[PDB]
Design a protein around this ligand. Structure first.
Ligand code: FES
Ligand SMILES: [K+]
Ligand SMILES: [K+]
Ligand SMILES: [K+]
Ligand SMILES: [K+]
Ligand SMILES: [K+]
Ligand SMILES: [Mg+2]
Ligand SMILES: [Mg+2]
Ligand SMILES: [Mg+2]
Ligand SMILES: [Mg+2]
Ligand SMILES: [Mg+2]
Ligand SMILES: [Mg+2]
Ligand SMILES: [Mg+2]
Ligand SMILES: [Mg+2]
Ligand SMILES: [Mg+2]
Ligand SMILES: [Mg+2]
Ligand SMILES: [Mg+2]
Ligand SMILES: [Mg+2]
Ligand SMILES: [Mg+2]
Ligand SMILES: [Mg+2]
Ligand SMILES: [Mg+2]
Lengths: 216, 113, 126, 170, 50
RNA sequence: AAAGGUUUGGUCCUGGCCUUAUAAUUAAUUAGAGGUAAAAUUACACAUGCAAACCUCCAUAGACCGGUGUAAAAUCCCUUAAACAUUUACUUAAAAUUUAAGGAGAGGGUAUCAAGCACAUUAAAAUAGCUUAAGACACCUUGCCUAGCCACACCCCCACGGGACUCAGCAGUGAUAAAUAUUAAGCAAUAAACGAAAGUUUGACUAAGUUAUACCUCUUAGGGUUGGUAAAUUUCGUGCCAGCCACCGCGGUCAUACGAU
RNA sequence: AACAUAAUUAAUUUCUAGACAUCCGUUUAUGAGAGGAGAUAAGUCGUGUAAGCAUACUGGAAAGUGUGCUUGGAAU
């Protein structure tokens, strides 16, 4: 070959473009700003879904609650209106760290960390909280913490093993007879190893994407 | 001790040049089938080999071992062995010096020199 | 094409002619075209009844198990096919749709009886 | 008339008659033979008749031949482990040489058969597709299945053109 | 199996080496007799030539 | 190729051209309907409409599908390594998908392109080497490797920047060309995107429209040819004129060769 | 050019800015001017010193002559 030649302009463009992104990174106060008259984000023009309209006017964001508290409410318990309606068992975050967005003129945007207790079961380590910019958060009062966090676990009643599908069960029993294994035991699937979290279980905020800084 | 990527893990060739320092230029030949004629011809390739001791001379048959990491752009082999030295061949079957199709030292004798 | 991102999937590739559909069950990267590059053919589905009135599905159940064990997703039509065969449990929407059809025919039967009763009133009027 | 002596050597059938398929260890086979002499006749015939067959079945093995360098003809194989197998072919017929190398460094019939079957594992007769890869392109070819509309017109009720007309009529 | 075949090969090389030494020995005996006769003719011719 | 016609005064040899077979496009003449397949002058300029959403806010997707053959001897096959903008399992191992560095072998034309001019090794930093008639270097041309792949995405190889500022998505238009499909319907099927989901979206696709370009099934009959090659001519007109031929040739008054019949 | 701020949750800023302005040279064509080789085909006056090859001189320019070579002439 040897007629393939360098592309300096492409190399220059890639680096230069990446540099500009770092310099002009947007802030949470800008990416997640909202115009409540139209329920549309000015930065991108994205109109919120219809099922979120009632709560955007009727509920508060997390750091709106925490900005009014000493130390940004470290140690306080916070729950979500969506959880309160869906799950009878206590669901809340125990706040451990909180990084407000200082640029915001009301310190109403930022990031938070805490220990999750979902449906009465508590995680062992603190991780970043997702959906902090949602209008769904409710601070728990200190005098009501003991009654709110009271939970007694019920014995688990979801089956631990189930039958095999009709065809796959016959193929298992047929192989037994072929190999000389004589038994009338029923093949059983074990569901303990593969049990699914609820769909609304908090997800990993650390591995989540962030929107770009190019305005529409 | 992973081996090289190159296909030629072991190549035999003739030393066609030795003017580079500690490197011997070696010409290997392989047989390639002509598809139209269905006859084999010789395709020759050049291999640079690391001659650490500069013990190679033009015209001697040598065995090269693929280096694990390429020493340079072209030096990707080392001198494993000198199968036949130019003018100084030693018969493999009998072990006696030979000069062409003849024995410089008879195989009946046992000089042990 | 040189795909970046995506996963292997088991899906139906449409073949045949106009008004004559025929499907090839294949394992393919999800970003590939429907009838384009695939990894393995895992069977075939002929959706038109044959002379005996039988819709014919062929499943390479050894290779299907291999690719599900390696992360291959399943398309919803293929999840329905495995449920009818008995290799998978019946899909939730297969059961729901069967219930909807039962509720929809019950209304029709009731309406026909009401119409017959209304027709009976016409018979009474003579 | 095909050029050269023994033009049968330049036919695919002759090249495929070779039975020496070397083990994966074999990497190089040097052939040292003499062009003049009486005890090296089999070696000369081996280069003339057999070397093409060996190369045809072992394309990745380097066969390099040297002439009139030693008093006697011999074969030296270089293996991937670094071992060197010397064979002495003086006073040996070309057929004898082939049988000797087949025994010491040739794959057995059992091993070769297993490789052939493994190669064809992914061809299935039931699979449908182009003629190059499959027996049948479409299920219409199978007997009893609905035939292709191109060859045989479909019933009107099985056609989207007809179904659309009824829906409009409804 | 590889080791056994590589041992059989060395035995074949030794068996053929033994035959080579036997054949070459016979040649030395015959060629020696011919050389002695040829040297005699040279001695006769050389004396005559002198 | 199972061959044939055609150099001569004649025979033989040599040798080119042409005929007979098969297919695609366009054109002349002609033509009913039905089923299917395909749709194609142009990397020239484009009016208008549509082609990417989803969703309890965050995200995910719009990196695909679809289009064109721009550039480049561009590639094929194979090895090693590492990843992914992934998947699914484990909190660590099986895949799909790529990327980078390579090389057993194979890979368009011109040699009136015969030299290239740093194209090498060593690793105290010296040595003077490296490729090349076994085709280097230069130039020219072309998508190939075909279940598909590769390159391109208004132009400046690239795209910070700049410019002459976007249909090479579907349909459609101007110009150009021997070359001429609907400014159409539906997301019911399959595929893709999104969502936990009922579901939503899609000019992908599906079912249609258009066209003797092909095949199939049928029903009307039209088109060409009639010296030889090579199947098949009656009368009359013309008179080296008018015309004809793929090749050999024909026509100057009995033309099976031109025109009508 | 690439520092420093901060630090009893921890983060911020930095993660640069100059310079391509454009070549030398390189290919394709418009093509004054002047020939060359063809096509249409009747003219033009000429044309026995064996022929040809190489070369030289002279011929308004087929040829003639010198020198060597060849028989693809003739020669009892
Ligand atoms: S090719 Fe099978 S339906 Fe047409
Ligand atoms: K001829
Ligand atoms: K002639
Ligand atoms: K481009
Ligand atoms: K649909
Ligand atoms: K006529
Ligand atoms: Mg969600
Ligand atoms: Mg046409
Ligand atoms: Mg595509
Ligand atoms: Mg091009
Ligand atoms: Mg020239
Ligand atoms: Mg354009
Ligand atoms: Mg571009
Ligand atoms: Mg268009
Ligand atoms: Mg576009
Ligand atoms: Mg057309
Ligand atoms: Mg999903
Ligand atoms: Mg007449
Ligand atoms: Mg004719
Ligand atoms: Mg006529
Ligand atoms: Mg002359």
């Amino acid at each position: 070959r040897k007629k393939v030649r360098p592309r300096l302009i492409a190399e220059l463009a890639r680096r230069v473009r990446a540099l500009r992104e770092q310099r002009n990174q947007p802030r949470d106060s800008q990416l997640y700003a909202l115009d409540y008259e139209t329920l549309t984000r000015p930065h991108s023009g994205r109109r919120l879904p219809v099922r979120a309209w009632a709560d955007v006017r009727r509920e508060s964001r997390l750091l709106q609650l925490l900005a009014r508290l000493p130390l940004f409410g470290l140690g306080r318990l916070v729950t979500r209106k969506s959880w309160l309606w869906q799950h009878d068992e206590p669901c809340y975050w125990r706040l451990t760290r909180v990084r407000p967005d200082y640029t915001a003129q009301n310190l109403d945007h930022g990031r938070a960390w805490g220990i999750l207790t979902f449906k009465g079961k508590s995680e062992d380590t603190a991780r970043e909280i997702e959906q902090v910019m949602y209008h769904d958060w409710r601070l728990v009062p200190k005098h009501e913490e003991e009654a709110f966090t009271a939970f007694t676990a019920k014995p688990e009643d979801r089956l631990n093993s189930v039958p095999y599908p009709p065809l796959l069960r016959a193929m298992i029993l047929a192989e037994r007879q072929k190999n000389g294994d004589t038994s009338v035991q029923e093949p059983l699937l074990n569901l303990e190893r593969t049990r699914m979290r609820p769909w609304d279980y908090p997800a990993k905020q650390e591995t989540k994407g962030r929107a770009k800084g190019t305005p529409v | 001790i992973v081996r090289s990527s190159v296909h030629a893990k072991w190549v035999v060739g003739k030393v066609i040049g030795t003017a580079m320092i500690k490197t011997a230029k070696v010409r290997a030949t392989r047989l390639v089938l002509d598809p139209y004629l269905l006859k084999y011809f010789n395709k020759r390739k050049t291999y640079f080999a690391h001659d650490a001791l500069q013990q190679c001379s033009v015209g001697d048959i040598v065995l090269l071992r693929a280096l694990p990491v390429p020493r340079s752009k072209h030096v990707k082999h080392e001198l494993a062995e000198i199968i036949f030295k130019v003018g100084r061949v030693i018969d493999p079957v009998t072990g006696k010096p030979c000069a062409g199709t003849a024995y410089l030292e008879s195989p009946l004798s046992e000089p042990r020199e | 094409k040189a795909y970046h991102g995506g996963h292997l999937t088991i899906r139906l590739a449409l073949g045949g002619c106009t008004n004559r559909p025929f499907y090839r069950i294949v394992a393919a990267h999800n970003k590939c075209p429907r009838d384009g590059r695939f990894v393995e053919q895992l069977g075939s589905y002929d959706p038109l009844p044959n002379s005996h009135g039988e819709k014919l599905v062929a499943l390479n159940l050894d290779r299907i198990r291999h690719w599900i064990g390696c992360g291959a997703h399943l398309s919803k039509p293929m999840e329905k096919l495995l449920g009818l065969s008995g290799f998978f449990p019946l899909h939730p929407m297969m059961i729901t749709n069967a219930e909807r059809l039962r509720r929809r025919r019950a209304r029709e039967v009731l309406l026909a009886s009401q119409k017959a009763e209304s027709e009976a009133k016409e018979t009474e009027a003579s | 008339p095909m050029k050269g002596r023994f033009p049968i050597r330049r036919t695919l059938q002759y090249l495929g008659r070779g039975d020496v398929v070397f083990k994966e260890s074999v990497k190089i086979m040097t052939v040292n033979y003499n062009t003049y002499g009486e005890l090296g006749e089999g070696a000369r015939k081996f280069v003339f008749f057999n070397i093409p067959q060996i190369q045809y079945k072992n394309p990745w093995v380097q066969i390099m031949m040297f002439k009139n360098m030693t008093p006697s003809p011999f074969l030296r194989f270089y293996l991937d482990s670094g071992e060197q197998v010397l064979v002495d072919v003086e006073t040996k017929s070309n057929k004898e040489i082939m049988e000797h190398i087949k025994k010491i460094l040739g794959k057995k019939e059992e091993t070769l058969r297993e490789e052939e079957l493994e190669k064809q594992q992914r061809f299935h007769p039931g699979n449908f597709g182009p003629r190059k890869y499959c027996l049948r392109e479409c299920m219409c070819e199978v007997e009893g299945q609905v035939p292709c509309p191109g060859l045989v017109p479909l019933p009107k009720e099985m056609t989207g053109k007809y179904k659309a007309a009824l829906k409009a009529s409804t | 199996e590889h080791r056994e075949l590589m041992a059989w090969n060395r035995d074949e090389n030794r068996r053929m080496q033994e035959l080579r030494i036997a054949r070459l020995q016979l040649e030395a005996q015959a060629q020696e007799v011919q050389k002695a006769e040829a040297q005699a003719q040279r001695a006769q011719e050389e004396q005559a030539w002198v």
